[PDB]
RNA sequence: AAAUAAGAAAUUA
């Protein structure tokens, strides 16, 4: 510490590790958080069994419990910083400066693609691509088709 | 002047002496000049035009077993119409030598883009957006 | 008329230069013809226009005929003369369309777009509900509510 | 990419100035708020010009016939209760049903900012003569 | 960045005037948070439902020594006015205090009571060049 | 509708303007982040990729 | 002559195709013409059913 | 047109056209019509072989290869228009 | 800013 015997060339790479822990904290807190939200905000009766004064009471009890949880991770994902695992360059996701499937910044994607490190395939810079789905409706459509095979092809039970 | 310094590369199991003097220079006013060309076994024999001096039994074996080179050249040029080859201007040039022995606002920047025979094909370090010579961006429908 | 707001006027020649895209778009030309026919009046200028333009469209992908150089410049001047003829044949039409449309709107108790003349009714441009509170070109103040060109019964 | 120059220090006694300025900006905002609430409610409560555009039908028709008959005898009381504000007026016309599908389709209504003028408005200039000291979003007289 | 107003002046690039996807700009700078509306007073930059509970930040959650400023999403409550206790908020340059308590504040978040961008400008936090550019826009007198 | 090029056969979005991540109804039908790609990123994308497979000291 | 029985080669005489005047005309058969409601329903059904397959059958 | 060029009576033929491309609520527009005309003409040629010679000469069977430019974020409109330029 | 599924036609070194 205090720049004595530092192992990595960029110190900020460590931040990337910190980020990982954030996601970990979210896995630990998501279910809990969301349940406490849903039970708190519910105006209709909770159920046949819990109604009226009991329900009001229980609602307040729960949001009191949720406020008491120190360090519970409530931060929405789009507000977490995206930072490269390689050069610790940052980019805004949903922008052309962040590349989502490798999760690296434009700067690193460029460097890694041009000196061959990533295996990708070059496609004409101006179109939609080789891909059928993108060719049809662009980004939104492909987004949809991904939803369709993750979820909708199942008739859940 | 903040004069840049380059430290010599010594020969290595993958990086032999001639590779080093030819691909690496310690004087950095000579960087980014241009490509140098050299010749190997056959292209050297073509460029250097070494007349073969006559020799022992193999050389006369190959003076008697030679056949018509006027014809062989012709055949090899023709053979480019075969399904697995192209027709070469080089093959033609060799035949010729044996017979005669006695848009427009951008085509600086389109310089790779037609159907181009290559020598060295371009590579992704040196070419940003080019797709390759075989590519058809605006295909027609053919039965 | 639904489109009421102040507008930007384009010189006739640039309107004609749109060719198939607007000025000669088949769809538009047909309902001009409908207006004339219904009023019981031949549409000759429209038909001239349609002829010229029809043919423009047919040859629109060809290269022009090869030019031999002349000191006279008779060729260049004859091409020009023909061209400005056609331009004028179409000016006449463009005028007819604006003319008859304004007149017909006068008969239908239609209110034109802002700052527009309707010969018998609004001599200076008619305006009501503009973004700007005065009449734009008179520089006179506008009444509330919007001025009425026609007597009330419908 | 040049190294960023350092920002100069803050100021001396600027912390006091910022405190005071925000303090009384807020105190002022209380009266600006009070006044604009007064204005908003005064507007909701007071009458407006007729919302419909008379240049089109079924509104152009002489005031003794058609829609105006329908208004004078069946809808009048209600139209006055809502003070000719253009939203409830248009809704009442939908619910009177004796016009029926026409309200949105054939009939034309004045644009938002004109329909908001106080009843009695004579010249168009009125839109621009309303008070700018008050934060109603054009919902003030 | 050109000038470093914080640490991040060193790490971040501006990228000219660059467009971000809708309602995601990397840095949340709410210039509009105090933006007067009489008719929208209870719906603008406040809770979407009036049956929502006050945020985390109106409550003392754990064993505290004390705080320096309370958060700006804290909502001003009748006790803020009545109790006569320090109510601070972190604004720039330093901190804004609610000193002069009014009931007109009640039920809104302090986001909304603190003007982010003041009409007041320090001439001493400005370079001579920057002061010139503020005179061009007709802000500073000269 | 088979009339639009974007036709998946299923109701991709529901057409409700106000609908938000806030609502108890949304919370009740919602995919939790556990064991999704987020977890995969959490573990495999880290500064020295080999530290994902083994303790450096151990290996060394 | 139906257009298929006409001899259109100036230089040849070709055997008349066996379907030439024979196939008859029912709008029920062809050309394909259909109600929009049914088309919608068909298309959607066909997407929703991709996975209802009994693989293992006697 | 293809029934004309081939000197045929359109009433002797039944046709159904099928859209295999990007579906849209309205295909009435000249480009789509160009494609239609072509489909019909190719079918007609498979049906009455000799009819191919008039058709081919009138350029019905001929396919033009044209496309809207691929989308691309460099351009303002996403296709043809480069962004504003200022001298330094 | 543009001669690229659009529709523009005549003053080279």
Automatic annotation (TrEMBL), chain A:
GO CC term (a single one): mitochondrion
Protein known as: Uncharacterized protein
Species classification: Eukaryota, Discoba, Euglenozoa, Kinetoplastea, Metakinetoplastina
The gene coding this protein: Tb08.29O9.64
From TrEMBL, chain B:
Designated name of the protein: Uncharacterized protein
TrEMBL record, chain C:
Gene from which the chain derives: Tb07.13M20.50
Species whose genome carries this gene: Trypanosoma brucei brucei (strain 927/4 GUTat10.1)
GO cellular component: kinetoplast; mitochondrial small ribosomal subunit; mitochondrion
Superkingdom of the organism of origin: Eukaryota
Protein's name in the database: Uncharacterized protein
Automatic annotation (TrEMBL), chain H:
Top-level taxon of the source organism: Eukaryota
Name of the protein in its database record: Ribosomal protein S9
Organism: Trypanosoma brucei brucei (strain 927/4 GUTat10.1)
